[PDB]
Design a protein around this ligand. Structure first.
Ligand code: KFX
Ligand code: MG
Ligand code: ZN
Length: 313
């Protein structure tokens, strides 16, 4: 119980900032996550041995895909850690616990294909779950790992604390379905502006945690430009593989997924920052003012994509 994880000095200082990159050394990512659990939650939250066994099973159930991989899982958990550490007193003991686990688990067993591709291929998961197909699968795999021998990291909670934390994780993982983000952010925008937003209304917290999840999920756009730019190559490598698979089903993919329309990526990134990213971090900043560095970095990256279009980069 006296075994604190510590990080080298550059990582000790830089892990606290929103724009931190967890680096290319896979074997350090588990320790980075435990460090984050220990500071956002406590050395007491999880039995170390159960946590390590859960982490390694979560890792093993992420696939070797260009973007939706173990590195993405730990990156999304780190953004959540930053939001939680900059908003100390706004979140319950169970939310702290649940939300870093939700982020680590949110894309479990992803195959690098959209819900839309599963539906057109007619994948078994598309009959088991007609909306948020992959996200219901991700939650399902989380409950699976939680029920392996020696993996119940929540075993010290009561039946009802346990049920609340699995309910927090389910909603949080479901909210990572970008189709659901637009409606959720519109409602939050309206509630905040008409002054009805109430962080004691459970159905309001839910929406606020959904938006945090979208924020953490999209956080590649809040990094240093060279991280953002190199991550975008991973993002399009998945989309263009799905594009090819659409063409194999005899379907012209949307241009986002057509490797023949590589040229239009800079303009596609503008659409994406304007329609999804900027609105996301704006509304988050309105609700949680200390998350402003995320909006500031996103804006800086929009401006870098604008330079790419002007041939300045
Ligand atoms: C950075 C980032 N993080 C997360 C997600 C989910 N995405 N999704 C995109 C894709 N955005 C996008 N690309 C194109 C496009 C691309 C090439 C040609 C034509 C159009 N249009 N749009 C809207 N970028 C991101
Ligand atoms: Mg996902
Ligand atoms: Zn994700």
């Amino acid at each position: 119980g006296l075994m604190q994880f510590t990080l080298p000095v550059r990582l000790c200082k830089e892990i606290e900032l929103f724009h931190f990159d967890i680096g290319p050394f896979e074997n350090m990512w588990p320790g980075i996550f435990v460090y984050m659990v220990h500071r956002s939650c406590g050395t007491s939250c999880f039995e170390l041995e159960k946590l390590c066994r859960f982490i390694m099973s979560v890792k093993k159930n992420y696939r070797r895909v260009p973007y939706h991989n173990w590195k993405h899982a730990v990156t999304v958990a780190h953004c959540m850690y930053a939001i939680l550490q900059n908003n100390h007193t706004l979140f319950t003991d169970l939310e702290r616990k649940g939300l870093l686990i939700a982020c680590l688990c949110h894309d479990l067993d992803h195959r690098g294909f959209s819900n839309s591709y599963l539906q057109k291929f007619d994948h078994p998961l598309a009959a088991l779950y007609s909306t948020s197909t992959m996200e219901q699968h991700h939650f399902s795999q989380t409950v699976s790992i939680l029920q392996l021998e020696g993996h119940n990291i929540f075993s010290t909670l009561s039946s009802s604390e346990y049920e609340q934390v699995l309910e927090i994780i389910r909603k949080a993982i479901i909210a990572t379905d970008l189709a659901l983000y637009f409606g959720n952010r519109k409602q939050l925008e309206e509630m905040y502006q008409t002054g009805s937003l109430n962080l004691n209304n459970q159905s309001h917290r839910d929406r606020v945690i959904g938006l945090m999840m979208t924020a953490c999920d999209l956080c590649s756009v809040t990094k240093l430009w060279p991280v953002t730019k190199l991550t975008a190559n991973d993002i399009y490598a998945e989309f263009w593989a799905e594009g090819d698979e659409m063409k194999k089903l005899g379907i012209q993919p949307i241009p986002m997924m057509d490797r023949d329309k590589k040229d239009e990526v800079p303009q596609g990134q503008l659409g994406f920052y304007n329609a999804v990213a900027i609105p996301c971090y704006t509304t988050l900043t309105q609700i949680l003012p200390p998350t402003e560095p995320l909006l500031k970095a996103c804006r800086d990256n929009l401006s870098q994509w604008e330079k790419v279009i002007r041939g300045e980069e």
